[PDB]
Design a protein around this ligand. Structure first.
Ligand SMILES: [Au+]
Length: 323
């Protein structure tokens, strides 16, 4: 384990001030330019656009173009230009730091796994929500595919077990994972029709590919709104906040390019331009940066540290999503 933040200190402690409860939704394949708030032609986030206090960041660039590359970089201390995906698993990451300082760390995953991020922490702090053994919401669609909203169920059980402590909950979304976008949402989010239902994205009509993708976004809009709503049921006892950032974008046929995973050296902009949302309760006194701040995945680690009143020398001058 190569550390980077053993100097990290928490200015105030939850026994001397209000405990802090953050959900960080780790998004999947969402494109910034298909977000209504960024100028997209379709209302893809109707539920999010109804909650006061949400900041939308119009200029966010992912560290890479793949789950395996981007997710470890999102929690890393090295920044995108020094980040080594092949060595990230044995570096201290920001969750390692917050757990060491006493923040309770929970990672629920409806995507795949934490891509090595959670490996140094006890395995019980990680839960697979792709399976009905944990996820109570799988029988709502013809595929019995378990749904992101199921990761909210039972979070009150977790809060009760951690009563009074600071908490950070990562919800790793299935989100817009392809190529089967049509499987990613229940029928209530099938607003754009017809939809593409094949694994060979090229054979599909372009409009039908886009409709499947946008429908999948409607389900993600619902999930994030339900996540904020769950947080508001604890705003009395906790300073609650919600960070969402997508791991990367997606190509939808631009220049005949589909899916993602292309190397940064020639990857198109659609694969790196990602949505980010921040919400906080007004009582917390957290102030977002300007909506048009130039931002990258490098902003995540300083954000999470600021949210828990932690300082560390390695990211002390890095720009965050919050002041
Ligand atoms: Au991904």
């Amino acid at each position: 384990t190569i550390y980077h933040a053993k100097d990290a200190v928490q200015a105030t402690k939850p026994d001397m001030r209000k405990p802090r409860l953050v959900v960080f939704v780790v998004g999947e394949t969402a494109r910034a330019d298909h977000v209504s708030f960024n100028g997209y032609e379709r209302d893809t986030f109707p539920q999010l656009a109804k909650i006061d206090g949400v900041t939308n960041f119009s200029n966010v660039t992912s560290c890479g173009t793949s789950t395996a590359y981007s997710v470890p970089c999102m929690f890393s201390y090295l920044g995108a230009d020094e980040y080594d995906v092949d060595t990230a698993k044995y570096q201290e990451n920001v969750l390692d730091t917050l757990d060491r300082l006493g923040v309770s760390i929970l990672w629920r995953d409806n995507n795949s796994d934490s891509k090595g991020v959670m490996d140094k922490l006890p395995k019980a702090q990680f839960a697979d929500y792709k399976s009905a053994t944990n996820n109570a919401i799988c029988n709502t669609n013809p595929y019995n595919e378990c749904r992101d909203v199921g990761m909210l169920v039972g979070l009150d059980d977790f809060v009760a077990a951690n009563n009074g402590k600071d908490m950070l909950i990562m919800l790793h979304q299935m989100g817009n994972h392809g190529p089967a976008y049509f499987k990613r949402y229940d029928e209530k989010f099938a607003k754009f029709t017809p939809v593409c239902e094949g694994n060979e994205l090229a054979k599909c009509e372009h409009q039908s590919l886009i409709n499947a993708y946008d429908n999948a976004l409607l389900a993600t809009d619902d999930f994030i709104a339900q996540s904020i709503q769950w947080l508001q049921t604890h705003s009395n006892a906790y300073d609650v906040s919600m960070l969402y950032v997508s791991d990367h974008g997606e190509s939808l046929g631009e220049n005949g390019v589909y899916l993602h995973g292309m190397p940064n050296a020639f990857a198109p902009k659609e694969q790196r331009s990602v949505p980010a949302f921040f919400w906080t309760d007004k009582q917390t006194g957290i102030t977002p940066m300007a909506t048009d701040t130039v931002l990258t995945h490098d902003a995540i680690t300083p954000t999470l540290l600021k949210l828990f009143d932690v300082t560390a020398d390695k990211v002390k001058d890095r720009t965050a999503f919050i002041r």
